[PDB]
RNA sequence: ACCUGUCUGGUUGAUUCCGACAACGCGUGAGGCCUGGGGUGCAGCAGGCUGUGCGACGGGCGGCGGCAAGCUGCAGGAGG
């Protein structure tokens, strides 16, 4: 069967303005669109399509033996704690800020591990990582906006990344399904206290 | 004059390894440097210990984004834990605009324009 | 309830130490500073008050501490060149102390003016008597001796020969020197961020205090070897003295002057020095019988009257 | 000698292609938990860089 | 072939550095350095001599620039 969204989780993404998608949508994105707002010219994203791409991304995440091999990256400073609260929780390796090019190809540098998956916050902001992953046969999940490019991305999570809470909500929910996939924690999470660690407050 | 990478990368390491033993006054800041390093020539000590004070002034303001000090994240995580006014409780009967409610017609709650 | 009465002309750099003496009807003040000179200040009648009386300018570098005798016959200088000196203020002539390796930090004289302790950054605090005779070095031969610089050291007054010693590791190590063995070593009242920079002793010798680089001051009674109370400070407090004829403390930090009542363990008054300079930093305030006198990192020496 | 047939195109994966990616997916239980068996997926190079690898993998995994 | 590294910009006497960056790390040169010059601490000895150190780093302050590098004025100082 299909897993249903909690009313707890869908409470988050409306005030995340994750369904407040973008003004422009590509034809690769139109299946993630139920409609567009005729008032603000903003495409509103399907939540049901957003949730099922999360569980496929969670399915692809756990399939590797070690989650620490997965190198998750975010260029912007909005997702700095969104990837920091993620990797303490999921047990992955974080990459924050500018991804140094050649980070997967050049073997003189050994700061991190050789990736078996990468997931990025934005292909616009981390175009260097999604290209460098394709040089080393490494898969790429990505959060992808309505205007964003999706080439060299295996799994698109249709969600907004131009809000400080938005990737903080998305990296939260992607961490929520992961232990739900393992059965480590159910949806009994009480979002009152957890998601604010992912949130970018300054 | 402009210091070089032989001085700046050196003085970056001194303030990073040995931050609490330092102070804003230069002559005390040099007195730690003979005690804790081995620098041969006395001019080049003054090159390093001068830039240590030029670092320790702006790391006292916390301006540099590179270096990382044990005291300065434990003070930061106190600032990180904001007493949370998350709007999930603050929003009651959520006003969602006219077409945004129509996509949630299968399973819905808190209906407002 | 503190009033800044007057100021001195003073040096052109940071005053490291202040000190006075009880003489027959004269109150000298000796102000050690960073421009390699130590001045002598009189405080008698108001026209005579604040006028330079003595001056010693033959040190090599910053006079990091100075020590004035309770008799007042002589003044012990502690300099960063590495050689302490015992200056006879009437003669103007000095002896030398050659024992330390480098950059002598602190000095103190006995109640009975027999011996003097000098502490430095070479992990040593070496004792001299009144002639220049290196009696003992207390580096590593005695166990529980601190493994970094000694920033401050004083004598316990009513006690015969007990010496207190603050250090960079935060351990205020106090010992009887009668037999060369350590009595106690404190740490936050219980027995390099934590780094005590200056300490004070009471008149009765029981009450004692030490500030630090941990933005904290700890006030303790050495006879019980127990902490009386603790008092918190905004910046890494450096200056510290003790009030005369009352159980009253006065701390000086990078910007402010905290006058903390001991027996009431509450803050009586605060004076801020931000009006004077930006790189103002109060180092080594000291009390007189009339009113307490506090020196500053720019060079001015400020006089305050307490209520 | 053997060459990986790409699942979605049906074409063989080209010779020494770096964009070619192995894709692993655990089967999902009825309540949504992970299972020990794994869907194993072969992906050609050019279908990634076209960006068309997304929408095909949506409909294949929807089955 | 070559290019990037070795740079839009800012900076420096300096490819000196800040910074953004398909580059990352290094190396020469530059700097550091060595000699003389001024200030004085100690020591030794006798148009005074020569050892040993200290002393200045652009440190402090004000204004520009701010991840800034730095520039510039003044104080202090024998010396900027």
Taking the CA of residue C193 and the C1' sugar atom of nucleotide E61, their distance in angstroms comes to 28
Q: To the nearest whole angstrom, how far is the Cα of A200 from the nearest Cα of chain B?
A: 9
Q: Which of residues 20 through 59 in chain D touch A, CB cutoff 8 A?
A: 20-26, 28, 30, 32-34, 38, 43, 48-55, 57-58
Q: Is C149 within 8 Å of chain B by CB?
A: yes
Give Rg (Cα) of chain B: 26
Q: For residue B59, which nucleotide's C1' is closest to its Cα?
A: E67
Taking the CA of residue C298 and the C1' sugar atom of nucleotide E66, their distance in angstroms comes to 27
Which residue is closest, via its CA, to the C1' of E54? C60
Q: Is B31 within 8 Å of chain C by CB?
A: yes
Determine which helix (DSSP H) or strand (DSSP E) holds C29, and give its type and residue range.
Answer: strand C28-33
Q: To the nearest whole angstrom, how far is the Cα of D60 from the nearest Cα of chain A?
A: 11
Structure token digits, residue A89: 């929780």
Taking the CA of residue A128 and the C1' sugar atom of nucleotide E21, their distance in angstroms comes to 12
Contact by Cβ (8 Å): A197, A81: yes
Residue pairs spanning A and D at CB distance below 8 A: 81
SS3 sequence, C125-173?
A: EEEEECCCCEEEECCCCCCCCCCCCEEEEEECCCCCCEEEEEECCCCEE
Structure token digits, residue C300: 């001015």
User: Which residues in chain A are closer than 8 Å to B106, comparing Cβ atoms?
Assistant: 48
Contact by Cβ (8 Å): D37, D29: no
SS3 sequence, chain D?
A: CCCCECCCCCCECCCCCCCCEEEEEEEECCCCCEEEEEEEEEECHHHHHCCCHHHHHHHHHCC
* Cβ neighbour number for residue C50 with a 10 Å cutoff: 18
| C12 CB burial (10 A radius; 0-12, 13-18, 19+) | exposed
CA–CA gap between residue B2 and residue B16 (Å, rounded): 21
Which chains lie within 8 Å of chain C at 3 or more CB pairs, if any?
Answer: B
Structure token digits, residue B88: 């999930």
Closest CA to C266 of C234, C221, C229, C303: C229
What was the resolution (in A) of this experimentally determined structure?
A: 2.9
Q: Is B34 close to C102, i.e. CB distance below 8 A?
A: yes
Closest CA to D44 of D35, D53, D32: D53
Q: Is C213 close to B20, i.e. CB distance below 8 A?
A: yes
Give Rg (Cα) of chain A: 16
CA–CA gap between residue A152 and residue A146 (Å, rounded): 16
Structure token digits, residue C31: 């102000």
Structure token digits, residue A57: 């991304």
* Experimental approach taken: cryo-EM
Q: Is B20 close to C103, i.e. CB distance below 8 A?
A: no
CA–CA gap between residue C192 and residue B62 (Å, rounded): 19
């Amino acid at each position: 069967k299909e897993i249903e969204i909690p009313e707890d989780f869908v409470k988050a993404i409306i005030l995340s303005n994750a369904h407040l998608g973008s003004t422009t949508a590509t034809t690769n994105f139109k299946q993630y669109i139920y409609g567009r707002r005729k008032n603000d010219l903003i495409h509103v994203i399907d939540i049901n399509e957003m949730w099922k791409k999360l569980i496929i991304a969670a399915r692809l995440f756990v399939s590797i033996e070690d989650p620490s091999s997965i190198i998750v990256a975010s260029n912007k400073k909005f997702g700095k704690r969104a990837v920091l609260r993620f990797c303490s929780e999921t047990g992955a390796t974080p990459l924050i800020g500018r991804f140094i090019p050649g980070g997967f190809t050049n073997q003189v540098i050994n700061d991190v591990k050789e990736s078996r998956l990468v997931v990025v916050s934005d292909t616009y902001a981390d175009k260097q990582t999604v290209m460098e992953a394709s040089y080393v046969n490494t898969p790429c999940i990505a959060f992808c906006n309505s205007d964003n490019s999706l080439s060299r991305v295996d799994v698109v999570i249709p969600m907004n990344n131009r809000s400080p809470l938005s990737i903080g909500c998305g990296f939260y929910l992607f961490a929520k399904v992961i232990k739900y996939i393992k059965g480590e924690e159910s949806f009994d999470v009480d979002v009152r206290s957890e998601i604010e660690l992912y949130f970018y407050r300054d | 004059r402009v210091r070089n990478s032989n001085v700046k990368r050196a003085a970056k390491n001194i303030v990073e390894k040995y931050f609490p033993k330092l102070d804003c006054d230069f002559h005390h800041n040099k007195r730690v440097l003979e005690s804790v390093t081995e620098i041969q020539t006395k001019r080049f000590k003054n090159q390093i210990a001068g830039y240590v004070t030029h670092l320790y002034t702006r790391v006292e303001k916390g301006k540099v984004k590179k270096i990382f000090i044990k005291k300065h994240e434990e003070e930061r995580e106190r600032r990180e834990n904001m007493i949370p006014s998350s709007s999930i409780m603050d929003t009651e009967k959520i006003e969602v605009d006219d077409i945004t409610m129509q996509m949630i017609k299968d399973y819905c709650y808190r209906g407002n324009y | 309830r503190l009033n800044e009465v007057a100021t001195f002309s003073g040096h052109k750099d940071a005053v490291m130490a202040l000190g006075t003496c009880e003489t027959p009807d004269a109150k000298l003040l000796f102000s050690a500073s960073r421009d390699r000179r130590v001045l002598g200040w009189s405080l008698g009648e108001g026209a005579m008050f604040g006028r330079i009386v003595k001056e010693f300018t033959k040190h090599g570098h910053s006079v990091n501490d100075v020590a004035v005798a309770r008799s007042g016959s002589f003044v012990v200088s502690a300099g960063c060149d590495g050689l302490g000196r015992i200056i006879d203020v009437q003669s103007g002539e000095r002896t030398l102390l050659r024992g330390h390796e480098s950059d002598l930090t602190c000095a103190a004289i006995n109640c009975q003016e027999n011996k003097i302790v000098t502490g430095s950054v070479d992990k040593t605090l070496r004792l001299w008597n009144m002639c220049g005779e290196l009696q003992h070095t207390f580096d590593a031969a005695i166990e529980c001796a601190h493994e970094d610089w000694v920033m401050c050291a004083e004598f316990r007054p009513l006690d015969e020969n007990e010496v207190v010693s603050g250090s960079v590791d935060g351990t205020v190590k106090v010992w009887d020197i009668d037999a060369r063995v350590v009595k106690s070593t404190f740490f936050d009242g219980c027995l390099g961020s934590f780094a005590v920079r200056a300490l004070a002793l009471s008149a009765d010798g029981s009450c004692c205090a030490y500030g630090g680089s941990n933005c904290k001051t700890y006030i303790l009674n050495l006879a019980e070897s127990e902490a009386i109370a603790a008092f918190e400070t905004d910046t890494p407090v450096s200056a510290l003295a003790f009030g005369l004829t009352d159980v009253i403390l006065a701390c000086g930090t990078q910007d402010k002057i905290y006058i903390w009542d001991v027996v009431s363990n509450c803050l009586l008054a605060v004076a801020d020095l931000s009006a004077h300079g930006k790189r103002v930093r109060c180092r080594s305030l000291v009390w007189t019988t009339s009113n307490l006198i506090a020196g500053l990192g720019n060079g001015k020496i400020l006089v305050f009257e307490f209520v | 000698f053997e060459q990986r047939i790409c699942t979605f195109t049906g074409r063989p994966i080209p010779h020494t292609d770096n964009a070619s990616v192995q894709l692993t997916f655990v089967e999902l239980d009825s309540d949504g938990r992970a299972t020990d068996k794994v869907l194993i997926y072969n992906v050609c190079g050019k279908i990634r860089k076209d960006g068309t690898i997304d929408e095909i993998l949506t409909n294949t995994l929807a089955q």
